Scaffold this active site. Structure first.
Site, PDB file in Angstrom:
ATOM      1  N   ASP A 144       0.863  -1.172   0.000  1.00 25.94           N
ATOM      2  CA  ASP A 144       0.000   0.000   0.000  1.00 25.94           C
ATOM      3  C   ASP A 144       0.905   1.229   0.000  1.00 25.94           C
ATOM      4  O   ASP A 144       0.762   2.128   0.828  1.00 25.94           O
ATOM      5  CB  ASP A 144      -0.923  -0.003   1.228  1.00 25.94           C
ATOM      6  CG  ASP A 144      -1.930   1.150   1.219  1.00 25.94           C
ATOM      7  OD1 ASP A 144      -2.233   1.686   0.132  1.00 25.94           O
ATOM      8  OD2 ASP A 144      -2.435   1.509   2.308  1.00 25.94           O
ATOM      9  N   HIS A 187      -2.569   0.444  12.248  1.00 26.14           N
ATOM     10  CA  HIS A 187      -2.288  -0.911  11.782  1.00 26.14           C
ATOM     11  C   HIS A 187      -0.841  -1.087  11.343  1.00 26.14           C
ATOM     12  O   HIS A 187      -0.153  -0.114  11.033  1.00 26.14           O
ATOM     13  CB  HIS A 187      -3.185  -1.234  10.587  1.00 26.14           C
ATOM     14  CG  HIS A 187      -3.185  -0.161   9.543  1.00 26.14           C
ATOM     15  ND1 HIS A 187      -4.064   0.901   9.568  1.00 26.14           N
ATOM     16  CD2 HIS A 187      -2.359   0.061   8.491  1.00 26.14           C
ATOM     17  CE1 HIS A 187      -3.777   1.731   8.578  1.00 26.14           C
ATOM     18  NE2 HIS A 187      -2.747   1.243   7.911  1.00 26.14           N
ATOM     19  N   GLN A 254      -2.606  -5.536   6.090  1.00 23.21           N
ATOM     20  CA  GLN A 254      -2.535  -4.459   7.079  1.00 23.21           C
ATOM     21  C   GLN A 254      -3.483  -4.826   8.222  1.00 23.21           C
ATOM     22  O   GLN A 254      -4.698  -4.816   8.045  1.00 23.21           O
ATOM     23  CB  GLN A 254      -2.945  -3.118   6.445  1.00 23.21           C
ATOM     24  CG  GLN A 254      -1.907  -2.558   5.466  1.00 23.21           C
ATOM     25  CD  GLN A 254      -2.455  -1.452   4.573  1.00 23.21           C
ATOM     26  OE1 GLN A 254      -3.407  -1.658   3.822  1.00 23.21           O
ATOM     27  NE2 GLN A 254      -1.844  -0.277   4.644  1.00 23.21           N
ATOM     28  N   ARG A 284       2.006  12.886  10.698  1.00 21.09           N
ATOM     29  CA  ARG A 284       0.736  12.730  10.004  1.00 21.09           C
ATOM     30  C   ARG A 284       0.065  11.531  10.660  1.00 21.09           C
ATOM     31  O   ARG A 284       0.514  10.393  10.498  1.00 21.09           O
ATOM     32  CB  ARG A 284       0.961  12.458   8.516  1.00 21.09           C
ATOM     33  CG  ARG A 284      -0.326  12.242   7.725  1.00 21.09           C
ATOM     34  CD  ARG A 284      -0.042  12.157   6.232  1.00 21.09           C
ATOM     35  NE  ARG A 284      -1.195  11.682   5.463  1.00 21.09           N
ATOM     36  CZ  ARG A 284      -1.688  10.449   5.533  1.00 21.09           C
ATOM     37  NH1 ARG A 284      -1.143   9.549   6.342  1.00 21.09           N
ATOM     38  NH2 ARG A 284      -2.722  10.108   4.777  1.00 21.09           N
ATOM     39  N   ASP A 286      -2.086   8.947  10.578  1.00 22.73           N
ATOM     40  CA  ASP A 286      -2.762   8.138   9.565  1.00 22.73           C
ATOM     41  C   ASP A 286      -4.005   7.402  10.066  1.00 22.73           C
ATOM     42  O   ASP A 286      -3.980   6.762  11.118  1.00 22.73           O
ATOM     43  CB  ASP A 286      -1.758   7.124   9.004  1.00 22.73           C
ATOM     44  CG  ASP A 286      -2.300   6.346   7.824  1.00 22.73           C
ATOM     45  OD1 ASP A 286      -2.351   6.908   6.709  1.00 22.73           O
ATOM     46  OD2 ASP A 286      -2.681   5.170   8.009  1.00 22.73           O
ATOM     47  N   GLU A 328      -5.381  13.008   9.643  1.00 16.92           N
ATOM     48  CA  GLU A 328      -5.778  12.501   8.335  1.00 16.92           C
ATOM     49  C   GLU A 328      -7.130  11.837   8.575  1.00 16.92           C
ATOM     50  O   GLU A 328      -7.195  10.656   8.929  1.00 16.92           O
ATOM     51  CB  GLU A 328      -4.792  11.455   7.813  1.00 16.92           C
ATOM     52  CG  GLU A 328      -4.916  11.188   6.312  1.00 16.92           C
ATOM     53  CD  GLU A 328      -5.431   9.790   5.968  1.00 16.92           C
ATOM     54  OE1 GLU A 328      -5.146   8.824   6.716  1.00 16.92           O
ATOM     55  OE2 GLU A 328      -6.107   9.656   4.924  1.00 16.92           O
ATOM     56  N   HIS A 392      -1.424  11.835  -2.466  1.00 12.52           N
ATOM     57  CA  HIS A 392      -1.028  10.534  -2.972  1.00 12.52           C
ATOM     58  C   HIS A 392      -2.254   9.639  -3.127  1.00 12.52           C
ATOM     59  O   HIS A 392      -2.179   8.578  -3.743  1.00 12.52           O
ATOM     60  CB  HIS A 392      -0.048   9.880  -2.007  1.00 12.52           C
ATOM     61  CG  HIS A 392      -0.626   9.620  -0.652  1.00 12.52           C
ATOM     62  ND1 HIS A 392      -0.986  10.635   0.208  1.00 12.52           N
ATOM     63  CD2 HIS A 392      -0.914   8.463  -0.013  1.00 12.52           C
ATOM     64  CE1 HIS A 392      -1.470  10.113   1.320  1.00 12.52           C
ATOM     65  NE2 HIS A 392      -1.438   8.797   1.212  1.00 12.52           N
ATOM     66  N   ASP A 393      -3.381  10.062  -2.566  1.00  8.12           N
ATOM     67  CA  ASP A 393      -4.597   9.269  -2.660  1.00  8.12           C
ATOM     68  C   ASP A 393      -5.607   9.775  -3.673  1.00  8.12           C
ATOM     69  O   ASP A 393      -5.493  10.867  -4.231  1.00  8.12           O
ATOM     70  CB  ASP A 393      -5.313   9.176  -1.309  1.00  8.12           C
ATOM     71  CG  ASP A 393      -4.731   8.107  -0.394  1.00  8.12           C
ATOM     72  OD1 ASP A 393      -4.198   7.092  -0.895  1.00  8.12           O
ATOM     73  OD2 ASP A 393      -4.830   8.277   0.838  1.00  8.12           O
ATOM     74  N   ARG A 509      -4.542   4.204  -7.879  1.00 15.11           N
ATOM     75  CA  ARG A 509      -3.922   5.375  -7.272  1.00 15.11           C
ATOM     76  C   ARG A 509      -2.500   5.592  -7.796  1.00 15.11           C
ATOM     77  O   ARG A 509      -1.987   6.712  -7.785  1.00 15.11           O
ATOM     78  CB  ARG A 509      -3.909   5.238  -5.750  1.00 15.11           C
ATOM     79  CG  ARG A 509      -5.279   5.371  -5.118  1.00 15.11           C
ATOM     80  CD  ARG A 509      -5.206   5.160  -3.619  1.00 15.11           C
ATOM     81  NE  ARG A 509      -4.815   3.792  -3.282  1.00 15.11           N
ATOM     82  CZ  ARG A 509      -4.533   3.380  -2.050  1.00 15.11           C
ATOM     83  NH1 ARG A 509      -4.592   4.231  -1.031  1.00 15.11           N
ATOM     84  NH2 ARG A 509      -4.197   2.116  -1.835  1.00 15.11           N
TER      85      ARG A 509
END
Ligand SMILES: OC[C@H]1O[C@@](CO)(O[C@H]2O[C@H](CO)[C@@H](O)[C@H](O)[C@H]2O)[C@@H](O)[C@@H]1O
Ligand SMILES: OC[C@H]1O[C@@](CO)(O[C@H]2O[C@H](CO)[C@@H](O)[C@H](O)[C@H]2O)[C@@H](O)[C@@H]1O
Ligand SMILES: OC[C@H]1O[C@@](CO)(O[C@H]2O[C@H](CO)[C@@H](O)[C@H](O)[C@H]2O)[C@@H](O)[C@@H]1O
Length: 628
Positions: A144, A187, A254, A284, A286, A328, A392-393, A509
């Site tokens: 990922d 995770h 994950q 960040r 996540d 995020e 990036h997403d 992506r």
């Protein structure tokens, strides 16, 4: 619950009498002691609200605080200076001086040493904040994009060593740039030692994840869980080889960490202190929404999730004051804003503004954007949005259906349109995006593609360059810390060949995660190319934002332009910004402008504009008028 004084006396018990005496007179302990008294109550309160009378709470807390002291004691003096600096200036995040950038070390610069060499470019651009994508060890092949962590301390060998990273962070600081990295705390990869040992039955790692014997629990949870990557698996669980099922909100590789176990908090807190002492300025956070689970609920944005984040915050106020959090949370707007607070995440992504920028380009109507800027922009003191255009997403249409209903807009039907438009399935669309996670059972779908591909630059749409400038102008001037997706400043297109890599073919992506384009960056100083035009325009807006006090802070007031195609807002009662989202000339009447000075200087084009008569904006033109 125990108190700061008691806990401190026990922390000192590890020293001999002579050493103890010495520690208690040291500046380091003095600072640590003061911060403990000031912030510990919050830490105790938040932890108690989650774990309650858990027997392991106090023991875990004393272990963590012992680590906290050792961590601060070892903390470098330069970083300690920053700790004091930010304690005295909590609003540094709100300065118009701040402009961030984000990139993958490998895609943008090959490796860490390569990245260090690009620092002069970042200074040239004017960056003061740089987010580097997942840098640590992860599974070979599919991870990922690095978000499946196998080690929070071992740097991905392909990028370099933990040593190169330290140099990069120090170099960044030398250039006046804050280092921003991910704290993937919800995770780990299924190859992380913790996961391996937990699944193998190691008592030391018992209850570190959520593992079930069969589908009974998973089936019950799935009744209310949202699917993030339905392409990968249904619901939020994946089955192990031995038949058991593990909670996997995202990819099957994950595994969600089990925060209902106080030892998981302790573990992750230790990892945070590690990152903190590397010199990281912002973490960040996540997937902050998923750190707490509860049967019968969506297992997103639950009260305990916020409390845990506030506990982590307290840990930094105590052992690394300089470390701030970037939330995020790509969810409903009412939920997004709840993570932002001085005692939680001081800053956070502003998906609402971002998604609505793209929405407006498609519809040519600023109604939704105006609504959001009017009712959901301003934030509590000492906090700020991180405004962006792309990341990036994928792009998710996270506007509120309730908000849209007030405008006579059906959220569901609207997203259907937006998705068709941005993947070029609508007559006349200039967008060349790719679908991401179309969910047959809900109708939901997201969009992949670079900013340049979405505005029509791939086919050389003559409005492409202007559209990019318009989007970035709003993120750079609405109030908050703007984040530039590096590569966008030269019009980098999609990685057309992502689907040929078997490790990426099932994740669109990657279409918007292209490598550094040498040809484009070589054209950045040439005004005859799209790259130079975009570059010089964004560089100019960046320069104006950083030097003009009128953009300082994150507060704004919307201005009714009386033209459904033009967005309007005012900063510090001195800067009037106008943005035409129509590909046709649009006018703001003299009547609408009566309260403004008869003449005003436009920071974008550099001309003096008359405001005592009709003001006509060219297609996609943006104006930054100094009205005071
Ligand atoms: O210093 C306070 C006081 O604590 C005692 C226990 O009552 O000893 C603890 O602190 C010492 C110095 O840090 C440690 O060496 C010792 O192991 C620890 O138990 C007293 O002896 C001391 O006067
Ligand atoms: O069951 C959900 C959730 O509860 C926890 C809380 O510690 O475990 C409890 O429930 C288990 C199954 O009934 C018991 O075996 C366990 O002893 C009990 O504490 C979490 O571990 C689990 O994720
Ligand atoms: O469409 C190209 C390519 O994208 C992938 C990987 O993301 O799937 C996306 O597109 C499919 C068809 O539109 C959707 O059904 C899917 O949900 C979406 O992620 C690849 O599967 C596909 O080849």
């Amino acid at each position: 619950s125990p108190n700061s004084q008691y806990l401190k006396t026990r922390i000192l018990d590890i020293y001999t009498p002579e050493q103890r005496a010495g520690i208690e007179k040291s500046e380091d302990w003095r600072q640590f002691s003061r911060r403990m008294d000031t912030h510990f109550p919050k830490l105790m309160n938040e932890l108690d609200s989650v774990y309650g009378n858990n027997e392991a709470l106090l023991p875990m807390l004393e272990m963590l605080l012992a680590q906290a002291w050792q961590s601060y004691s070892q903390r470098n003096s330069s970083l300690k200076d920053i700790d004091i600096a930010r304690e005295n200036n909590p609003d540094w995040i709100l300065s118009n001086k701040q402009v961030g950038g984000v990139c993958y070390v490998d895609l943008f610069a090959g490796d860490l040493k390569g990245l260090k060499d690009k620092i002069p470019y970042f200074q040239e651009l004017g960056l003061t904040y740089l987010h580097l994508m997942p840098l640590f060890k992860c599974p070979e092949g599919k991870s990922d994009g690095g978000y499946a962590v196998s080690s929070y301390r071992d740097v991905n060998p392909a990028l370099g060593t933990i040593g190169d990273l330290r140099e990069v962070i120090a170099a960044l600081h030398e250039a006046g740039i804050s280092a921003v990295v991910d704290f993937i705390f919800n995770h780990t990869s299924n190859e992380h030692e913790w996961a391996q040992r937990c699944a193998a039955g190691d008592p030391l790692f018992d209850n570190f994840y959520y593992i079930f014997p069969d589908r009974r629990m998973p089936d019950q949870y799935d009744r209310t869980l949202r699917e993030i990557f339905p392409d990968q698996h249904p619901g939020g669980f994946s089955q192990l080889e031995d038949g058991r099922w593990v909670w996997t909100t995202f990819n099957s590789f994950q595994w969600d960490l089990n925060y209902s176990n106080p030892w998981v908090f302790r573990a992750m807190a230790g990892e945070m202190l590690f990152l903190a002492n590397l010199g990281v300025d912002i973490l960040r956070m996540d997937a902050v929404a998923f750190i707490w689970k509860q049967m019968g609920t969506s297992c997103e944005n639950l009260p305990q999730a916020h409390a845990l984040i506030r506990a982590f915050n307290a840990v930094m106020r105590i052992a690394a004051p300089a470390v701030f959090f970037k939330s995020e949370a790509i969810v409903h707007p009412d939920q997004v804003v709840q993570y932002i607070g001085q005692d939680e995440c001081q800053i956070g992504y502003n998906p609402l503004q971002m998604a609505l920028l793209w929405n407006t380009l498609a519809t040519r109507e600023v109604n939704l954007l105006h609504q959001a800027l009017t009712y959901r922009h301003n934030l509590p003191e000492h906090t700020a949005w991180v405004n962006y255009v792309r990341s990036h997403d994928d792009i998710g249409w996270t506007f509120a259906d309730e908000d849209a209903a007030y405008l006579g807009i059906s959220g569901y039907d609207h997203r259907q349109f937006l998705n068709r438009f941005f993947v070029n399935r609508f007559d006349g669309s200039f967008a060349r995006g790719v679908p991401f996670q179309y969910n047959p059972s809900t109708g939901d779908c997201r969009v992949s593609g670079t900013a340049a591909a979405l505005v029509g630059l791939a086919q050389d749409d003559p409005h492409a360059v202007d559209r990019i400038k318009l989007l970035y102008s709003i993120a750079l001037s609405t109030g908050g810390l703007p984040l530039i997706y590096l590569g966008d400043e030269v019009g980098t297109l999609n990685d057309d060949d992502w689907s040929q890599d078997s490790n990426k073919s099932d994740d669109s992506r990657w279409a918007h995660r292209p490598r550094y384009n040498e040809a484009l960056y070589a054209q950045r100083n040439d005004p005859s190319t799209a790259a130079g035009q975009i570059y010089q325009d964004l560089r100019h807006m960046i320069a104006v934002r950083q030097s003009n006090p009128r953009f300082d802070g994150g507060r704004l007031v919307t201005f009714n332009t009386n033209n459904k195609h033009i967005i309007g807002y005012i900063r510090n009662n001195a800067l009037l910004a106008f943005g035409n989202f129509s590909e046709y000339p649009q006018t703001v009447t003299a009547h609408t402008l009566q309260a403004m000075p008869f003449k005003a200087h436009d920071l974008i084009g550099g001309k003096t504009v008359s405001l005592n008569q009709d003001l006509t904006l060219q297609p996609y033109q943006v104006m930054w008028l100094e009205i005071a």
